Assembly symmetry: C3
Homo-oligomer: 481 residues x 3
């Protein structure tokens, strides 16, 4: 007689995963699906990262004297440090919109235009904004005051004869007293009107004392205007006008701005976070919900294990609640007890089928990467109300939905992996049973008892699939009965 | 002796779908789940579609002379063309999008005239920039009041809401270009308009200054609106620069909206409208446009998604073990028998019907029929604004990504389950057939049986029907086997 | 000879569930996953609920005379009733919703009085529209400054922030109805109010004009607010039309919110609060309201979702097995054996298969979906007036969220039902296959889920088969002789 047993491998150390029907199940192999660490540095490749050391984007746009190294710059990502400061006092109504559009433009290209201001004096300065040892001002703005003892009505025009949009930055000066207002501007109540063929803005200055900032009790408000090709710009002013010196060329692209204190190093990475660059070889990440580039999706979980092997079962006997830790050639194989001696082999068909069905399984459902460049703000330092609440709500909803998606996907994939491995083992056992028609009996433990003399060539023929039952039919029948 | 095999059908040409464990598997039949084309026309049934032609909704509401055919109009969807223009006095609307959305969602342009009394001022002002034929004109729903004689008295009027519906009032403020013009039109050197109710107020101070010429005018007019709830009162107080209203608009709650499109409108029936045109809604997903009106499929980024309908296509007596039957056209599963009389073939109705019933209506168990949406947010912009536009784009992008993921995962899961159920059906039929033949037959290794007793056509039909009796032939089969 | 059968239990009354491959399938047990009812009452534990009664949050903050009981109050949820009204000077708040949300999220009404000096003006002005008992009054947290004698000097005051917490200041501007009233109350013919810090500024010019009478007044007051960070300074500059502040509000960070409801408040314990009332959170989904506070189930559009708990239900039709036949007489377990012998029929139960099925079924839904989500302050979801862009965006966001979560719930229920049915069927088949494996050549299956054994198999034999210590070599010769 002879014995033939079928089984599967085992490893000394398994990994616990979670499926649809099991809280904890041990498998031979698993992989991590969530990235939860960073090196703390920002790669300067392949994206173009511009470090604004002590300057904000608005300050560099306006022309702060200590921000003059940023003139005519361009970037893919602008990094704003927490140690930035202003050294020139002003306020911007709707600051966030201007900051966002300047960041999304991706450039600081400024073209000077020849404005004519007749009857007034130009190039005013203050001691609060020093350009060297002398008084200065913003380099992209012009402070106009009275000439002699008169301040006439200003009325200038400039058409857009190009084929791209223009961006104009202008301002209004708010004095602190009526005496100062009349001293700088002869009229007791100024007025600034800037309009195009389709839009208009009129600002009336406000007079009143304010806290001293670098020695000044007055302020300046900043406004902007966009002129389409074929349109025209008209500026009408009675006083308190901070005239523009030109226009900014505005483009459309994939630029943005980020707040971070991580240093920038010479390295390559496609994903940038405020914590630093992270690899994008995993479908999910847990570092930061603020990202730039090709980045994994953000989830609330810190670990998600995906099974890449069959069950780990501790240990002649077959595969019925028994693993073979002595198998290193393949996933499934045969063991036989013969007159010549015991032997072991491996089956390549089932092993390769399982490997093919396992490899690349996650790519069939979830896409590889998503490239997002400019998005909404997700951290705030001041309380505002309605819009901030809406933004926070949207971000929270997105995060919760994606976390649920990740959890369900991982559970389903683990369940299907376990099912396919079990099906492969059972199919191999059933094929082996079907090949031996009447010459063998099932021993009850995944093994077969062959009732005729089956030598090594016989076992090899059984394993190959070229076994003939008619050769040993009568001998097996005589032995069985 | 005899032979009884089991098998399944196959087709000369199959389709490749994707499952959970397979990236490409061939099946006998599949259907497309994504709609990706349109005819370029807009159906005027069953929704009421109003063509704006050369007019916008705001211009038609104000009373533009070339938009006078749109007075007292009704619509379910308003279509705005890119060739629309303005031909009246230049104006601007602060928060234009909010008023446009309000008027579009109201769904009607019904106007009721009221008896306003303006004592001491001139009425019915006009300009050469807004012509009613050969003579000067103005917006038909607004009244331009200027000085009478040499005085402009203080205007203070009231109007109560004694109905049971909301009232919408449209008024304006005139911004002159020079101080001399301001003094000439209105005696006072600084005008002021105050419009208020018992719960809200608005005060506007005009701005004097030159502006680019538009149809010969360097002055502008700003447009404002006020809503008066039932039982409330409206008070208008002014001393210059008032563009008075002539009445109120009825404002309703409904399912109306507005769209920007250039597709023509033709006689046809469709429940879904896109800027590209009308599309059928028989499929659960679409790829034409993310701007939709009516009962429409969900927008996904995928161009195609195939759902499996049949079984695995296996190319071609032998059984079902890696062998499909090309010559079978009468069913999905059946029998082939080899006998002394000759060969034959049949089909199994029960297993085929079970598989068909399981397959039929498979996708309706999860996805709702249709999502009918009428008024939504704007999804395309022609000018950069900032915060709110970014928020809207972010919301739309998140929605699109989530629904694309849902569609992909669902299609993969359904294909996997269809393949599994069909394989289980075939294996169950074979197992039952083996179960009937207790000891008179044994499996030959290729999904087919070898019978050791003389089993004729009546015998084969008895086996197929499920009424086979092994006791009659047991002794002969046992003698043949041993 | 002896007969051995395998089968499963069934119940007289079943319940219908929905799976991936079946529209309507009957099982032995199921549970409801959607909470669609409420008691109509709000529990005051464990959250601190503050009833607004006839006052709103803004009215309580300003100092309305009939809202004077809400001074220095704290809350976790503020409940605003539909019967609230105002009984003081008419006013309007530009961007009212932002201030309401700010005060609701702050969670307290703590007020600290500060010593402002207003030189050359008369303080503590009142009106007949706001009565403190028999006499004329005003808001308790605001100061109405008017001319003293025949002059109104320019006011310029400062107040530094020397603490380590943010300050909130509430002030206002008065809008007269006539120029004569403007001149009588304030000497200057045009007022101006400037309030600023080192990083912000606000200037308001009053409006003049008649308005509808509210409690005898055709004038209004506009409300503005300012926040001062630690180390900053506040400056107020004005020459008329100023409603001065009396101090600052302590502003905090926390998990407080506000809700509009008309449900009464009783003594009970509940972790979730809805405008309909409190609901239990023992289910993953609910259908009551999309406005919630606390640990609440997710909101879905469906009103019922049944999760299968048992196996398929098959009516019971010489003993028979599990092939299209249930056992209504089995109450000892899920799977078992039935044997007919010469001594008589017998029945038993199998514990391992039943225990495995129960352990797989138990706790199945906790593996994918989280228990509860704690949300405290969110966006508004109901509006009493039409506004335009922002309201449309909020409605769109809420509708998208609801649709996505409803789809998730439906798909999850269907998948779980399918897997439960599959696991029960697999367990029964595995038990039958093991029973076949034990009897190698001594019996053959009859096809109805039963084995009939050729040798003599008594109670010891049947018990050995059930346990698993059955030996086939003992009866092999007798079985072979009987079969052939
Ligand atoms: C309306 O009300 C506001 C606020 O109440 C007033 O604003 C104040 O204006 C005064 C000037 O009139 C400001 O005083 C100035 O402060 C400067 C900064 O002081 C800070 O820094 C120094 C050094 O670091 C510290 O010692 C000090 O404590 C502060 O922390 C000083 O540098 C100025 O000095 C100048 O004047 C002195 C006078 O002796 C000279 O000796 C000096 O050489 C120098 O010339 C000056 O003292 C004050 O800071 C303002 N306060 C605020 C909050 O802004 C308005 O003046 C008031 N308007 C009217 C019309 O009344
Ligand atoms: C403040 O600054 C602004 C802009 O700098 C000034 O606005 C300009 O005002 C002048 C008039 O004062 C405008 O000139 C007018 O332009 C009309 C349109 O011009 C277009 O069309 C004509 C004909 O097709 C073309 O030839 C031309 O190139 C343009 O393409 C003309 O139709 C007007 O014609 C009138 O004047 C002529 C003079 O010869 C007469 O013969 C005509 O019959 C007719 O009466 C006129 O020329 C100019 O367009 C305005 N510019 C802008 C940008 O709007 C303000 O006037 C100024 N304010 C002060 C107080 O100085
Ligand atoms: C600009 O235009 C507006 C609106 O047209 C005017 O506002 C009106 O001003 C008048 C003048 O005061 C107001 O009249 C007063 O109304 C009070 C309330 O009346 C309501 O309530 C009573 C009782 O509940 C009802 O019977 C009545 O129908 C109203 O529903 C009255 O109580 C006042 O009575 C006083 O005067 C009478 C005079 O005989 C005395 O007998 C009384 O004892 C008492 O002293 C008074 O009649 C009117 O309410 C205002 N309407 C609105 C809508 O605001 C502005 O006045 C106007 N401005 C200018 C400069 O012209
Ligand atoms: C363009 C201009 O007028 N520049 C002035 C500037 C302004 O007058 C002021 O900042 C606007 O509010 O002020 C400068 O400072 C002045 C002192 O030099 C002078 O002694 O006193 C003035 C006040 O009475 C004023 O502070 C400055 O800021 O440097 C002078 C500069 O030319
Ligand atoms: C209601 C009214 O006053 N209408 C005027 C109109 C206005 O005066 C003006 O548009 C407001 O800015 O202007 C009209 O045009 C005028 C010419 O006819 C006149 O020769 O010159 C005027 C300038 O000095 C003015 O342009 C118009 O727009 O048709 C006349 C109309 O009655
Ligand atoms: C702080 C103050 O001035 N308070 C006045 C108040 C105001 O004058 C008014 O409400 C602001 O618009 O008005 C009071 O009412 C007055 C009557 O008592 C008086 O007979 O007539 C006045 C009109 O000419 C005015 O209505 C009030 O509202 O009680 C008096 C209060 O001291
Ligand atoms: C990445 O940086 C963020 C900073 O935004 C870290 O999140 C903060 O972590 C600290 C310390 O636990 C908390 O006190 C803050 O509340 C967190 N902020 C937010 C917005 O969550 C985060 O821990 C960092 N992650 C890694 C891996 O370095
Ligand atoms: C329906 O119309 C839209 C117009 O928005 C088409 O989308 C544009 O397609 C062109 C050509 O590929 C692109 O260059 C644009 O970028 C697309 N615009 C947007 C906003 O996506 C769309 O292709 C049309 N679809 C059909 C089926 O005609
Ligand atoms: C909980 O209260 C809400 C209040 O909005 C109820 O929803 C309204 O129910 C009425 C009556 O059927 C409808 O006419 C409204 O259209 C509903 N409003 C909304 C926004 O859906 C809700 O039915 C209540 N729930 C329970 C269980 O009583
Ligand atoms: C486990 O799987 C990973 C990839 O999924 C593979 O690289 C690794 O070799 C596997 N483990 C073993 C022991 O082969
Ligand atoms: C393929 O399936 C569709 C159902 O989507 C059916 O209408 C069609 O008849 C099927 N094809 C064949 C050849 O049966
Ligand atoms: C059905 O299941 C519930 C819990 O899921 C349990 O409380 C109940 O007893 C079960 N019903 C029966 C008849 O076992």
């Amino acid at each position: 007689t002879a014995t033939l047993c079928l089984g599967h491998h085992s490893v000394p150390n398994g990994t616990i995963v979670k499926t649809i029907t099991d809280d904890q199940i041990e498998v031979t192999n698993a992989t991590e699906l969530v990235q939860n660490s960073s090196t703390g540095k920002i790669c300067n490749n392949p994206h173009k990262v511009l470090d604004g050391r002590d300057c904000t984007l608005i300050d560099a746009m306006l022309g702060d004297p200590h921000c003059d190294v940023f003139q005519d710059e361009k970037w893919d990502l602008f990094v704003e440090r927490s140690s930035a400061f202003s050294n020139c006092p002003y306020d911007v109504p709707d600051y966030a919109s201007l900051r966002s559009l300047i960041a999304s433009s991706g450039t600081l290209d400024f073209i000077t235009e020849s404005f004519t201001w007749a009857g007034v004096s130009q190039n005013g300065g203050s001691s609060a904004c020093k350009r060297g040892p002398a008084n200065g001002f913003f380099s992209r703005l012009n402070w106009l005051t009275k000439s002699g003892s008169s301040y006439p009505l200003l009325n200038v025009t400039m058409p857009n004869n190009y084929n791209f949009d223009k961006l104009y930055i202008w301002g209004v000066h708010h004095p602190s007293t009526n005496q100062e207002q009349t001293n700088l501007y002869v009229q007791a109540s100024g007025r600034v009107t800037v309009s195009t063929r389709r839009s208009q803005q009129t600002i009336v200055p406000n007079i009143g004392s304010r806290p001293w900032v670098r020695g000044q009790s007055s302020r300046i408000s900043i406004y902007w205007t966009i002129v389409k090709p074929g349109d025209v710009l008209v500026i009408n002013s009675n006083g308190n006008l901070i005239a523009p010196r030109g226009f900014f060329k505005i483009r459309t692209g994939r630029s943005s701005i980020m707040r971070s204190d991580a240093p920038i190093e010479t390295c390559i990475s496609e994903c940038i976070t405020p914590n630093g660059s992270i690899p994008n070889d995993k479908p999910f990440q847990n570092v930061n919900k603020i990202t730039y580039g090709a980045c994994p999706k953000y989830v609330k979980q810190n670990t998600l294990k995906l099974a890449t092997g069959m069950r780990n079962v501790p240990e002649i006997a077959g595969f019925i609640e028994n693993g073979w830790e002595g198998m290193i050639d393949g996933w499934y194989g045969f063991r036989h007890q013969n007159s010549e001696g015991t032997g072991q082999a491996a089956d390549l068909k089932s092993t390769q089928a399982a490997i093919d069905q396992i490899n690349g399984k996650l790519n069939r459902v979830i896409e590889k990467t998503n490239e997002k460049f400019h998005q909404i703000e997700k951290e705030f330092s001041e309380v505002e109300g309605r819009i901030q609440d809406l933004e926070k709500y949207v971000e929270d909803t997105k995060v919760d939905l994606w976390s649920y998606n990740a959890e369900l996907l991982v559970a389903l994939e683990n369940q299907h992996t376990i099912d396919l491995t079990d099906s492969e083992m059972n199919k191999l056992f059933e094929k082996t049973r079907r090949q031996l028609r009447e010459n063998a009996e099932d021993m009850g433990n995944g093994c077969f008892k062959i009732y005729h003399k089956c030598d090594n060539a016989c076992i090899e023929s059984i394993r190959n699939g070229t076994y003939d039952h008619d050769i040993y039919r009568d001998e097996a029948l005589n032995n069985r009965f």
